[PDB]
Design a protein around this ligand. Structure first.
Ligand SMILES: O=c1ccn([C@@H]2O[C@H](COP(=O)(O)OP(=O)(O)O)[C@@H](O)[C@H]2O)c(=O)[nH]1
Ligand SMILES: [Mn+2]
Ligand SMILES: [Mn+2]
Length: 306
């Protein structure tokens, strides 16, 4: 089939051709735990993530593989990453510090003040006073600590998994163009404004992915308890409107979460804005399926961070 229907609208299954890059992510809070000529990506028995990425790059010889990284790497570590690129010619290491996200950012004071205004406009007998008090307290804390704090500066390495989760969605807004923005060589056959297939490093490829066909060019991982998840996110284009929708939630909500609000609500509110379908049906509609991936293998060994 070439179309699917959800919540009463028809969506074509759009192709992600075999060009579309795969993108893995490694944000490393403590790069000093690696040797200074060591690639600073976890590669232990239980979390053999660098090996997994390499095996994927070997399988997908013909496709660009991004490794989207962040952390205070040494010069030695940057050189070992360069060397990985020399060794597997399809691997492109993208440093988060080389990308500009200011077009997606918002100040926290701004967000807090907009919410406080809105709540204070509601009657005392109508409104959520606990939230109003909590937002006021968060505003007081930001003004004391760093008035210029933004969404993006706030989702930093001291925030655990929120660091990588937040910047993963930002990367997906940029799509393939991020390779070019970061100055990576040999990326000029990527489609301008094109997409990417983001995978957690424990999503093991056992053969070639081929061409994918996704509804409105987007799909994400579903775990089965059935939940949306962020460990696979595929888009066929930059600034996918469903992801822009979720960013709008992040810009409006105090305490927006990259998984629960940006990804999960953004996509659901985009595709089922009136909430006429079951969360489970949405999951079936959006699910990224592929027989040549063994999904979320950390769940059968151990999480690399939980
Ligand atoms: O220190 C960390 C730990 C995890 N991750 C990212 O989080 C993903 C998921 O990690 P894992 O599968 O270990 O976590 P879980 O399945 O428990 O969410 C990894 O592939 C990385 O992209 C990261 O960037 N830095
Ligand atoms: Mn259910
Ligand atoms: Mn996992």
């Amino acid at each position: 089939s070439g179309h699917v229907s959800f919540a009463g609208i028809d969506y074509p299954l759009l192709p992600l051709n075999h060009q579309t890059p795969l993108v893995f992510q490694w944000f490393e809070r403590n790069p000093d735990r690696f040797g200074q000529n060591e690639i600073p990506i976890i590669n232990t028995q239980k979390n053999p993530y660098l090996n997994n990425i390499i095996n994927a790059a070997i399988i997908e010889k013909e496709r660009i593989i991004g490794i989207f990284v962040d952390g205070d790497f040494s010069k030695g570590q940057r050189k070992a990453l360069g060397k990985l690129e020399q060794n597997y010619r399809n691997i492109k290491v993208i440093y988060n510090s080389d990308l500009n996200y200011s077009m997606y950012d918002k100040k926290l004071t701004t967000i807090y003040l907009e919410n406080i205004t809105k709540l204070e406009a509601q009657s005392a007998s109508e409104r959520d006073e606990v939230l109003l008090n909590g937002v006021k307290k968060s505003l007081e804390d930001v003004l004391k600590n760093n008035p210029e704090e933004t969404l993006i500066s706030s989702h930093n390495k001291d925030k655990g998994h929120l660091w990588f989760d937040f910047y993963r969605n930002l990367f997906l807004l940029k799509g393939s163009d991020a390779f070019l923005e970061a100055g990576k060589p040999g990326c000029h056959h990527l489609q301008p404004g094109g997409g990417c297939i983001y995978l957690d490093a424990d999503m093991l490829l056992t053969d070639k992915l081929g061409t994918l066909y996704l509804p409105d060019g987007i799909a994400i991982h579903v775990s089965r308890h059935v939940s949306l998840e962020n460990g696979i996110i595929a888009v066929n284009r930059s600034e996918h409107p469903a992801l822009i929708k979720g960013l709008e939630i992040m810009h409006s909500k105090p305490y927006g979460d990259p998984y629960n609000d940006w990804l999960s609500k953004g996509l659901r509110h985009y595709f089922d804005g009136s909430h006429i379908q079951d969360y489970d049906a949405f999951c079936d509609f959006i699910e990224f399926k592929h027989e040549n991936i063994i999904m979320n293998t950390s769940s059968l060994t151990a999480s690399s961070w939980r």
